[PDB]
Amino acid sequence: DVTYFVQSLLRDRNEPDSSLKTAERIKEECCYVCPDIVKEFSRFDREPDRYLKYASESITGHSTTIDVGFERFLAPEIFFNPEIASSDFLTPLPELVDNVVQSSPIDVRKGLYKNIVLSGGSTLFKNFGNRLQRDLKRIVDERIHRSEMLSGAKSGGVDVNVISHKRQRNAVWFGGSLLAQTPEFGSYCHTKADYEEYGASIARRYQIFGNSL
């Protein structure tokens, strides 16, 4: 969806190339997460080398050059303002992570904020974990201070830590590898002997959610 947004902005400027691979490569290389898009639009007036030039080769095998502009910051903003991307989803990622931890049981909330692990390729934007941490720390401390101001006593607070790590790009595969190495692993699998008795219904029940029956 951030590629379709980059592609749509190249296409609005009528740039020489707006193929999907060129919009993808402009995310991986040119895009980053800013603090605030009206300040960053203003920085693209104040400082001239904020606009990059990207060299792309066409499907029929010739060179092109693309000016890359405000999509550098406005396209990663899709996570922090999803009203840019969609009519149907509205809650920004720092508020959405707050809703996960505040719906979760009270005794685990420090642990869930103390270790916010990032995963999957689309978390790799420059400054992404820092924008998530600062905006979630703002939400969390404003909620704690509403309580300190009613009670007349300072809290211990909570540390919000967003964690970017060397295996973040493929964390699901590296976890799957680490968990399948366990001596017990073959006992958690469906065996084909289970499938010979019960068929594909053996896999139907939800693992993650609470089931009725």
Partner: protein
């Protein structure tokens, strides 16, 4: 001296026996004016033939009196033969015997009218009608071979072994350089170029023979053309407009290997060559594979001998050499072969003399010629 006239569907090749190339090569065309002749004097005629029709073509409706090796317009064919003898060779046809040519599996009426016109209007003393691909084997200097001949109107395979043709194994395909020219007119429209007058068909015929070639692997050349500028070449129209063209350079000739490009059900020229060898007796096939002789202008594409060798090596069993024989003069080899046959000291009993025509009528030709 005898005359040799190879009545091609697209070009006349004509000359004398014992010469090493045709004296006359010109379009097998009659043109008539299609516009208002407002100006008196100035050298006009009601009709034009060959190179005159080709030079004046902007003002003429051109047509060929030959369709698929059959004469469809005899009054225009008389004008082409008259131009051949009196204008282009500059001979009285009453003084010289004439060797003519046709494709195998033609209508018998084609050969009857062609012998009748030659005795009864050109007053020729003696004449003969050879099979074009039997003449191409004389030019090659061979007694055995399978000859793929493809001209303007027909493609045909005739296998010959030790001087005997196998008439049941002869294959004919009414697809050659006219069908490739018309398919190039079709696919030039998808690049945005419209060619529709019979004069514009002659421009596309010239684009075909300066720019088209046979791809050794078609599906790899399609991928190469879809991903490169290096395939593309340019041509100057008579207008000084420059066209540019790409995969259409090898899609046009690939119709010989895929006749379904023009909506034909036929097998390709590699399959009909192999089917013709496989209709022959099992002992002769080894020497036919080693002597695949190519002839006529539709065999002149760059890379066609190499694709033909690749494809027939993929049909045949791997233990014997497939050799495609593609002379640099193969565009004239039917006429060269007629010059040899009419010059051979053993052939002078085989002419139809007018004395035989005077008692038998035009049906004489079916018992004097193969």
């Amino acid at each position: 001296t005898a005359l040799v006239c190879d009545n091609g569907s697209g070009l006349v090749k004509a000359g004398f026996a014992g010469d090493d190339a045709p004296r006359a090569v010109f379009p097998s065309i009659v043109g008539r004016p299609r516009h208002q002749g407002v100006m008196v004097g100035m050298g006009q005629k009601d009709s034009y033939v060959g190179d005159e029709a080709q030079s004046k073509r902007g003002i003429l409706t051109l047509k060929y009196p030959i369709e698929h090796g059959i004469i469809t317009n005899w009054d225009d064919m008389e004008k082409i033969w008259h131009h051949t003898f009196y204008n282009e060779l500059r001979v009285a046809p009453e003084e010289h015997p004439t060797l003519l040519t046709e494709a195998p599996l033609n209508p018998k009426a084609n050969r009857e009218k062609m012998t009748q016109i030659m005795f009864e209007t050109f007053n020729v003393p003696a004449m003969y009608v050879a099979i074009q691909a039997v003449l191409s084997l004389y030019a090659s200097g061979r007694t055995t071979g399978i000859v793929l001949d493809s001209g303007d109107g027909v493609t045909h395979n005739v296998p010959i072994y030790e001087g005997y043709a196998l008439p049941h194994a002869i294959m004919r395909l009414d697809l050659a350089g006219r069908d490739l020219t018309d398919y190039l007119m079709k696919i030039l429209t998808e690049r945005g170029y419209s060619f529709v007058t019979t004069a514009e068909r002659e421009i596309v015929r010239d684009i075909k023979e300066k720019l088209c070639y046979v791809a050794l692997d078609f599906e790899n050349e399609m991928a190469t053309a879809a991903s490169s500028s290096s395939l593309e070449k340019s041509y100057e129209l008579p207008d000084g407009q420059v066209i540019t063209i790409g995969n259409e350079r090898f899609r046009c000739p690939e119709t010989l290997f895929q006749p379904s490009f023009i909506g034909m059900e036929s097998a390709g020229i590699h399959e009909t060559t192999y089917n013709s060898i496989m209709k022959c007796d099992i002992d002769i096939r080894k020497d036919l594979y080693a002597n695949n002789v190519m002839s006529g202008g539709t065999t002149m594409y760059p890379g066609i001998a190499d694709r033909m060798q690749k494809e027939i090596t993929a049909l045949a069993p791997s233990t014997m050499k497939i050799k495609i024989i593609a002379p640099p003069e193969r565009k004239y080899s039917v006429w060269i072969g007629g010059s040899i046959l009419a010059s051979l000291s053993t052939f002078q009993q085989m002419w139809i003399t007018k004395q035989e025509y005077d008692e038998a009528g035009p049906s004489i030709v079916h018992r004097k010629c193969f």
